[PDB]
C-alpha cells in the first residue's frame, strides 16, 4: 500500500522557527533546509512517475 | 527523471549548525529535522515498493 509523508516541500520552505539565545545561525539552517526541499521535490516527482506507471501496468493486466 | 538526491537521513543527523548570540531555537529546528528524517525513510520505502511492484507487473505482462 501507499505510504504518506508528514511534510511537503512547501511546508519546509514556509516553516517559521522562533528564535532564542544561542540558537542555530539562521543562514546555516536555511541553506540546509533548501537542500532538503529539493530532495522532497525529487522524491515527490519520482513517486508521481512510479505511481502513474503502476496504474498503467495494472490496467493492462485488467 | 533520475534520483539526484542530495542528502540522507544519516547526513541530516550528523549536520551541525553554528550558533549565534541569537538564532533559531534549537529545540524547534531539531524536532522539525526529526520529522524530516522520518519522511526520508517513508519516501525510500514507497519508492522501493513501487519499483518492485512495477517490475513484477512488467514481468507478468510478458510471461
Ligand atoms: Zn505498501
Ligand atoms: Zn504499492
Ligand atoms: Zn504510493
Ligand atoms: Zn552560507
Ligand atoms: Zn504531486
Ligand atoms: Zn524517474
Ligand atoms: Zn562535530
Ligand atoms: Zn532504494
Author numbering:
A (entry chain B): -2 to 0, 5 to 63
B (entry chain A): -2 to 0, 5 to 64
Which text from the study accompanies this structure?
GpsB has emerged as a major regulator of PG biosynthesis in low G+C Gram-positive bacteria, and its homologues (DivIVA/Wag31/antigen 84) in Actinobacteria play essential roles in hyphal growth and branching. To gain molecular understanding of GpsB function, we report three crystal structures of PBP cytoplasmic mini-domains in complex with GpsB, the first structures of a PG synthase in complex with a cytoplasmic cell cycle regulator. The PG synthase arginine finger pokes into a negatively charged cavity situated between α-helices 1 and 2 of GpsB and is fixed in the same orientation in all structures, just as the phosphoryl group defines the binding orientation of peptides to 14-3-345. Therefore, the role of GpsB in the bacterial cell cycle is that of an adaptor, docking PG synthases to other cell wall enzymes, scaffolds and shape determinants into protein complexes for division (the divisome) and peripheral growth (the elongasome).
Since GpsB in both species interact with class A PG synthases, we next determined whether the rules established above for the BsGpsB:BsPBP1 interaction could be applied directly to LmGpsB:LmPBPA1. Therefore, the K32E variant of the N-terminal domain of BsGpsB is as close a surrogate for the equivalent LmGpsB domain that could be obtained. LmPBPA1Arg8 and BsPBP1Arg8 are equivalent in their interactions with GpsB. Of the other GpsB-binding determinants of BsPBP1, LmPBPA1 lacks an analogous BsPBP1Arg11. The sequential equivalent is LmPBPA1Tyr11, but this residue is completely disordered and its mutation to alanine reduced the affinity for BsGpsB1-68Lys32Glu only by 2-fold. LmPBPA11-20Arg8Ala and LmPBPA11-20Arg12Ala mutations reduced the affinity for BsGpsB1-68Lys32Glu by >15- and ~4-fold, respectively, and had significant negative impact on the LmGpsB:LmPBPA1 interaction by BACTH. Reintroducing positive charge into LmPBPA11-20Arg8Ala did not restore wild-type binding affinity in FP as LmPBPA11-20Arg8Ala,Ser16Arg still bound to BsGpsB1-68Lys32Glu with an affinity at least 10-fold weaker than wild-type. It would thus seem that LmPBPA1 represents the only GpsB binding partner that employs the TRxxYR motif in L. monocytogenes.
